What we know:
Blueprint: E1 15-17, E2 23-29, E3 37-42, H1 53-61, E4 64-69, H2 88-104, E5 110-116, H3 117-128, E6 135-141, H4 152-162, H5 182-189, H6 201-217, E7 225-230, H7 238-247, E8 253-258, H8 270-286
Bound molecules: ligand NUX.
The ligand CCC(F)(F)C(=O)C[S@@](=O)c1ccc(C(=O)N2CCN(c3cccc(Cl)c3)[C@@H](C)[C@@H]2C)cc1Cl binds next to strand 5, helix 4 and helix 6.
Enzyme class: hydrolase
EC number: 3.1.1.23
Subunit structure: Homodimer.
Amino acid sequence: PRRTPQSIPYQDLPHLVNADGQYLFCRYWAPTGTPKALIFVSHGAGEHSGRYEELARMLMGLDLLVFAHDHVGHGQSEGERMVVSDFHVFVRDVLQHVDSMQKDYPGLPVFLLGHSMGGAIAILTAAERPGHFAGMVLISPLVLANPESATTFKVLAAKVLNSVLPNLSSGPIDSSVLSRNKTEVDIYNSDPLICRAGLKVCFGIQLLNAVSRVERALPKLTVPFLLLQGSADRLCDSKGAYLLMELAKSQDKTLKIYEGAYHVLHKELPEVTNSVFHEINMWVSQRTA
Ligand SMILES: CCC(F)(F)C(=O)C[S@@](=O)c1ccc(C(=O)N2CCN(c3cccc(Cl)c3)[C@@H](C)[C@@H]2C)cc1Cl
């Protein structure tokens, strides 16, 4: 019997099998009545779908059917940890799950919600099907890297290195950059489904590929979106949020900056987190009324 990396049989859990024959763990939050819309939640690098419990329960409370899976190599899904043959695998698998849910709920609008690497996934998904999605909620999406982190010289060394030792690790993540909320950093550091190990250079190359692909996608992007960004984000540089606002073709685009906030805005200081929830609630409510 096929089992999650934590040894739980997939037959006990919601799942799907992707185009490469890998089992992905799925999560669903369905209202009691006919939903008004569908929304897919796209998690970030090293995390998993269970970190969106509270946001998902809020969206289900608006009578959306919320659904997610753990990306390949993440959470309770199969695959070598935090490795992907090419970044587009994540997009492909999102589209499989979206197409499965649309078949079951024909005619309902479908939204995307993406954070971090999952925001880059959401952008690329929406740019692959222009006109298809009703809207996107992006929380600190990967659009631009921290310019210090990703100099021409560090990127050219990292391509040379990846041609020899694609499995070489960077250091562990500084989880202290994720949030000013120390209890949320402690929760992240003790979550057995998070990968906080070094990133492999081959996966760092796939994140640079995502950044490249997002830039080429922005002039195709027409989908309505809400963009939430902290000013003190050391992973997804705030300059990327400005770039997405400038280059997207979307007629309906809104940015809110959280002054002083770190990366995980939905698990930040309580004033930030409460604002993030409220803004998502109003933006989705307006567009499902
Ligand atoms: C919890 C959710 C989440 F994890 F926060 C996200 O999904 C964040 S994910 O979008 C992400 C974004 C940026 C970085 C990061 O600091 N860098 C800078 C250095 N980069 C780089 C530099 C030289 C060479 C190479 Cl090969 C790569 C990449 C590793 C990447 C662009 C790291 C990550 Cl993990």
